Design an enzyme around this catalytic site. Sequence first.
Site, PDB file in Angstrom:
ATOM      1  N   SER A  17      40.680  -8.443 -54.362  1.00 30.36           N
ATOM      2  CA  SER A  17      39.506  -9.197 -54.825  1.00 30.36           C
ATOM      3  C   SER A  17      38.358  -8.267 -55.212  1.00 30.36           C
ATOM      4  O   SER A  17      38.018  -7.338 -54.460  1.00 30.36           O
ATOM      5  CB  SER A  17      38.975 -10.066 -53.690  1.00 30.36           C
ATOM      6  OG  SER A  17      39.924 -10.948 -53.128  1.00 30.36           O
ATOM      7  N   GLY A  18      37.767  -8.551 -56.359  1.00 27.02           N
ATOM      8  CA  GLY A  18      36.617  -7.809 -56.851  1.00 27.02           C
ATOM      9  C   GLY A  18      36.921  -6.496 -57.532  1.00 27.02           C
ATOM     10  O   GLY A  18      36.052  -5.953 -58.222  1.00 27.02           O
ATOM     11  N   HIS A  71      33.319 -14.178 -54.805  1.00 27.38           N
ATOM     12  CA  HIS A  71      34.034 -14.745 -53.644  1.00 27.38           C
ATOM     13  C   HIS A  71      34.112 -13.827 -52.451  1.00 27.38           C
ATOM     14  O   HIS A  71      34.374 -14.305 -51.355  1.00 27.38           O
ATOM     15  CB  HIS A  71      35.388 -15.359 -54.012  1.00 27.38           C
ATOM     16  CG  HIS A  71      36.505 -14.386 -54.160  1.00 27.38           C
ATOM     17  ND1 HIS A  71      36.968 -14.000 -55.405  1.00 27.38           N
ATOM     18  CD2 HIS A  71      37.281 -13.822 -53.208  1.00 27.38           C
ATOM     19  CE1 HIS A  71      37.976 -13.170 -55.166  1.00 27.38           C
ATOM     20  NE2 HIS A  71      38.205 -13.051 -53.856  1.00 27.38           N
ATOM     21  N   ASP A 130      33.200 -16.080 -61.101  1.00 26.42           N
ATOM     22  CA  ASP A 130      33.464 -15.249 -59.940  1.00 26.42           C
ATOM     23  C   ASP A 130      33.049 -13.807 -60.237  1.00 26.42           C
ATOM     24  O   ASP A 130      33.898 -12.953 -60.505  1.00 26.42           O
ATOM     25  CB  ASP A 130      34.945 -15.329 -59.534  1.00 26.42           C
ATOM     26  CG  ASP A 130      35.229 -14.784 -58.157  1.00 26.42           C
ATOM     27  OD1 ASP A 130      34.262 -14.485 -57.421  1.00 26.42           O
ATOM     28  OD2 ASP A 130      36.430 -14.624 -57.815  1.00 26.42           O
ATOM     29  N   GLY A 165      42.810  -9.080 -50.772  1.00 24.27           N
ATOM     30  CA  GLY A 165      42.306  -7.728 -50.538  1.00 24.27           C
ATOM     31  C   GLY A 165      42.057  -6.934 -51.800  1.00 24.27           C
ATOM     32  O   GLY A 165      41.328  -5.927 -51.768  1.00 24.27           O
TER      33      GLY A 165
HETATM   34  C1  R3A Z   1      44.240 -20.152 -55.111  1.00 28.44           C
HETATM   35  C2  R3A Z   1      43.908 -19.869 -53.641  1.00 28.44           C
HETATM   36  C3  R3A Z   1      44.529 -20.933 -52.733  1.00 28.44           C
HETATM   37  C4  R3A Z   1      44.290 -18.437 -53.194  1.00 28.44           C
HETATM   38  N1  R3A Z   1      45.692 -18.113 -53.434  1.00 28.44           N
HETATM   39  S1  R3A Z   1      46.501 -17.018 -52.560  1.00 28.44           S
HETATM   40  O1  R3A Z   1      47.870 -17.111 -52.969  1.00 28.44           O
HETATM   41  O2  R3A Z   1      46.158 -17.238 -51.186  1.00 28.44           O
HETATM   42  C5  R3A Z   1      45.901 -15.427 -53.028  1.00 28.44           C
HETATM   43  C6  R3A Z   1      44.788 -14.885 -52.395  1.00 28.44           C
HETATM   44  C7  R3A Z   1      44.069 -13.899 -53.010  1.00 28.44           C
HETATM   45  C8  R3A Z   1      44.445 -13.391 -54.286  1.00 28.44           C
HETATM   46  C9  R3A Z   1      43.716 -12.420 -55.033  1.00 28.44           C
HETATM   47 CL1  R3A Z   1      42.217 -11.800 -54.413  1.00 28.44          CL
HETATM   48  C10 R3A Z   1      44.140 -11.990 -56.277  1.00 28.44           C
HETATM   49  N2  R3A Z   1      45.264 -12.471 -56.827  1.00 28.44           N
HETATM   50  C11 R3A Z   1      46.006 -13.369 -56.175  1.00 28.44           C
HETATM   51  N3  R3A Z   1      47.216 -13.848 -56.742  1.00 28.44           N
HETATM   52  C12 R3A Z   1      47.777 -13.480 -57.904  1.00 28.44           C
HETATM   53  N4  R3A Z   1      47.210 -12.523 -58.624  1.00 28.44           N
HETATM   54  N5  R3A Z   1      48.910 -14.038 -58.290  1.00 28.44           N
HETATM   55  C13 R3A Z   1      45.640 -13.900 -54.888  1.00 28.44           C
HETATM   56  C14 R3A Z   1      46.366 -14.915 -54.207  1.00 28.44           C
HETATM   57  C15 R3A Z   1      43.396 -17.387 -53.869  1.00 28.44           C
HETATM   58  O3  R3A Z   1      43.797 -16.814 -54.875  1.00 28.44           O
HETATM   59  N6  R3A Z   1      42.220 -17.047 -53.292  1.00 28.44           N
HETATM   60  C16 R3A Z   1      41.426 -15.947 -53.867  1.00 28.44           C
HETATM   61  C17 R3A Z   1      40.040 -16.434 -54.181  1.00 28.44           C
HETATM   62  O4  R3A Z   1      39.402 -16.988 -53.024  1.00 28.44           O
HETATM   63  C18 R3A Z   1      40.161 -18.093 -52.521  1.00 28.44           C
HETATM   64  C19 R3A Z   1      41.551 -17.667 -52.128  1.00 28.44           C
END
Ligand code: R3A
Length: 236
Positions: free
Chosen positions: A188-189, A44, A93, A186
């Site tokens: 992510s990955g 992603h 992913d 942020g």
């Molecule tokens: C479920 C989506 C609406 C969106 N949700 S979000 O709340 O905006 C958000 C954003 C990023 C997150 C990442 Cl990278 C890791 N962990 C999370 N949350 C958690 N561990 N509880 C993240 C929560 C979401 O996860 N992403 C990440 C993947 O690409 C699409 C957007």
Amino acid sequence: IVGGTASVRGEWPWQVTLHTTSPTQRHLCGGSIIGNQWILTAAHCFYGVESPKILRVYSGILNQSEIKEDTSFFGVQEIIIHDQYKMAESGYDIALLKLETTVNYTDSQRPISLPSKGDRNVIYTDCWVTGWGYRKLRDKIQNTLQKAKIPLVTNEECQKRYRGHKITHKMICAGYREGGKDACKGDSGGPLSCKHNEVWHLVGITSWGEGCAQRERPGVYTNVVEYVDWILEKTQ
Ligand SMILES: CC(C)[C@@H](NS(=O)(=O)c1ccc2c(Cl)cnc(NC(=N)N)c2c1)C(=O)N1CCOCC1
């Protein structure tokens, strides 16, 4: 990372910061060193990325402020995204970055092992998520690499919290019942690293979650052990 604490130099030597350089230079995603020319990260991260030309991999970084015009980095030769990847929430992913040169291992940059052949039934109890990500939904990238210990939750519990999604055996979840500590935008990955018999293993890749550190909304990660054959095929 929500509810995390500052890491120190050499604490997570497999952790990298992947930067984009267009239209501005900034931290795009975390990733993990898994070999001399290989970074394992999330698919992603590459949404809207034109080509690997605009990417830079910085290793042995603690603070994002350390990155200056003369800071060494690795170019990206190739981005290998899993062929079934559609969107983070649907799985697959996972991506590999092949570097333009080999990483010389030091106390600040070292690879992390994948979950081992024969460890499919290990119960991991010392798992950590690390990153320069947000401390809440509306925040900014952090300067100092953050760390948080998170307990794994079963796939059965995870599915009950995400009835609108298909939580497959290719995903692994982690979170506290009352929230408070978790990955966020942020992160992510980056890695979900677990220590078993004093050896760290790359168990998860930070993928998604509903909000950040919300009660009964655990973080969802790519379950690395389920992609070992794919990683080995791509890296050989
Ligand atoms: C479920 C989506 C609406 C969106 N949700 S979000 O709340 O905006 C958000 C954003 C990023 C997150 C990442 Cl990278 C890791 N962990 C999370 N949350 C958690 N561990 N509880 C993240 C929560 C979401 O996860 N992403 C990440 C993947 O690409 C699409 C957007």
